[PDB]
Amino acid sequence: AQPIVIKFSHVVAENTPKGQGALLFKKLVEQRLGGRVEVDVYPNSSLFGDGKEMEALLLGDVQMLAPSLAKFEQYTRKVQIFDLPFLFDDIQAVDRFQRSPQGRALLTSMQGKGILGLAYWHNGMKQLSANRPLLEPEDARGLKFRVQASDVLNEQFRQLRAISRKMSFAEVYQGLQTGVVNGTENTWSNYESQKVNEVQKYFTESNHGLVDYMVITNAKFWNGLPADIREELQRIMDEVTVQVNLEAERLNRDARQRILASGASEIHTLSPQQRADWRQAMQPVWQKFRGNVGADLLQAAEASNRP
Ligand SMILES: C/C(=C\C(=O)O)C(=O)O
Ligand SMILES: [Cl-]
Ligand SMILES: [Mg+2]
Ligand SMILES: [Mg+2]
């Protein structure tokens, strides 16, 4: 009789990899478990936004989240590895890293704080945007970039002699519109779904980092479920993860196409030489975090680039 409630809060639009994943998890759970588990999905920060969502998870005011891997520094300093620029060539590489023993272990890295990782969901690679062309690294100097609340990402832009402003995802469009910030970094999906292309005249397809998610829950809640239900929820989560990874690839592509079709933002692609120039300018930031992430994680992550 007593329905089990899973409030699943996230900050993105519905027509995105995570937005679709949350909705699919709801659909499959409600259909397969016959209503014993209810999943209430809250997109676009409608329940909780960045930062506040984690506070809520610890207090039991929400049961499921899927934050960007860049937003966990207050819970563990190991997951920061995912934010290092140019560490992963593409999503295939980060996937290999995530499936390694160390990558699997990161799902438990916050267990001591009451947070359990259930899955990794892909979004895509990060691009650069601004209201001026970003062709070479010197072009970023003196600009104000919005970043996720991440020490690594702050330092990434400081390394370029740019200014970083940590701001919640909900506030990016207005920040750029009103000039609080000049540029940012994100996946095509996030840019187009929030209409940020309307307030950014230039994009550079840098693929200089990535956005992936860790699906997380409150340990007390998850462990308090009947074992048969918990195990089935995890199997369903595994099926949803497969679907999300598919949605991510095509949704990012479609978003890029929509931005290009507007004919009101330009997209600059880089030659290998041009991308290497950006890499040379940004890679020194790794020095500031190699202690936190550790030699082993770095080695494993770099090795993921070799099939
Ligand atoms: C990557 C971000 C959000 C998200 O959840 O996709 C962000 O830029 O805040
Ligand atoms: Cl937000
Ligand atoms: Mg219902
Ligand atoms: Mg909004």
Residue 19 CA to ligand 4 centre (angstroms): 13
For residue 130, give the nearest of 169, 178, 181, 170 by alpha carbon: 181
Residues with CB under 6 A from ligand 1: 11-12, 68, 123, 148, 169, 186, 190, 211
Q: Which atom of ligand 1 is nearest to the CA of 186?
A: 8
Compute the residue count for the chain: 307
CA of 237 to the centre of ligand 1 (A): 21
d(CA 202, CA 225): 49
The CA distances from residue 154 to 7, 85, 289, in Å, are 31, 12, 12
Nearest ligand (C-alpha, residue 44)? 4
Start-end of H helices in 106-226? 151-159, 172-178, 188-193, 219-223
Tell me if residue 60 falls in helix, strand or coil: coil
Tally of domains within the chain: 1
Which tokens sit at 222?
A: 């998850």
What is the C-alpha separation between 216 and 129, in angstroms, rounded? 30
Q: Which has the closest alpha carbon to 98: 117, 85, 113?
A: 117
Say if CB 121 and CB 245 are below 8 A apart. Answer: yes
Cα–Cα distance for residue pair 240/289, rounded to 1 Å: 33
CA distances from 2 to 24, 38, 146, 233 (A): 23, 10, 44, 17
Closest CA to 186 of 178, 177, 195: 195
> What is the C-alpha separation between 230 and 34, in angstroms, rounded?
15
252 by Cβ neighbours in 10 Å (0-12 / 13-18 / 19+) ranks as buried
Pairing of strands 183-186, 115-130: antiparallel
Which tokens sit at 102? 């160390």
Percentages helix, strand, coil for the chain (3-state, rounded to 5) are 50, 20, 30
In three-state secondary structure terms, 15 is: coil
What is the identity of the amino acid at 147? V
Rg of the Cα trace of the chain?
A: 19
108/224 Cα distance (integer angstroms): 17
Method by which the coordinates were obtained: X-ray
E strand residue ranges, the chain: 4-9, 37-42, 64-65, 115-130, 144-147, 163-166, 183-186, 202-218, 266-269
Q: Are the C-beta atoms of residues 6 and 42 closer than 8 Å to each other?
A: no
Residues belonging to the binding site for (S)-malate are 18, 71, 146, 186, 190, 213
Q: Which helix (H) or strand (E) holds 101?
A: helix 101-105
Residue 228 Cα to ligand 1 midpoint, Å, equals: 33
Residue (of 157, 149, 119, 126) closest to 282 by Cα position? 157
Distance of CA 74 to the CA centre of its chain: 16
Alpha carbon separation from 153 to 108, 188, 249 (Å, rounded): 23, 18, 24
Is 262 buried (19+), middle (13-18) or exposed (0-12) by CB count in 10 A?
A: exposed
Q: CATH number, domain at 196?
A: 3.40.190.170
State the residue range of the domain holding 61. 4-303
